[PDB]
Design a protein around this ligand. Structure first.
Ligand SMILES: *[C@@H]1O[C@H](CO)[C@@H](O)[C@H](O)[C@H]1NC(C)=O
Lengths: 49, 48
């Protein structure tokens, strides 16, 4: 559950590491991590014309 | 027999025309295009 990994400049309950996008968005830890958070293959916001 | 029979067959020439002998042929009309677009980021689907 990504709700546990702390946001950048914020508080959280679990140490959390990830890829470039996650580290840009969330706070990537410098200690031993508890979970790996990759960025979604194709997710986003879809808009229809 | 005189004063009898005397049947007449007539061939009227109505008109003479220079008709056309067609060769190849095809058909055509008016067409307009419609497009469907879908934009995906890199490494999504077949966006390689
Ligand atoms: C990421 O997801 C897309 C589907 O959106 C898939 O086609 C692609 O192979 C995936 N890339 C990976 C798993 O590296």
């Amino acid at each position: 559950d990504i709700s546990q990994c702390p946001k950048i400049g914020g508080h959280g309950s679990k140490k959390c590491t990830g890829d470039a996008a996650f580290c840009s968005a969330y706070e990537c830890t410098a200690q031993y991590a508890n979970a790996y958070c990759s960025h979604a293959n194709g997710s986003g916001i879809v808009q229809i014309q | 027999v005189k004063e009898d029979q005397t049947k007449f067959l007539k061939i009227k020439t109505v008109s003479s025309e220079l008709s056309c002998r067609e060769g190849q042929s095809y058909w055509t009309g008016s067409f307009s295009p419609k497009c469907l677009s879908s934009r995906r980021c890199h490494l999504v689907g077949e966006c390689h």
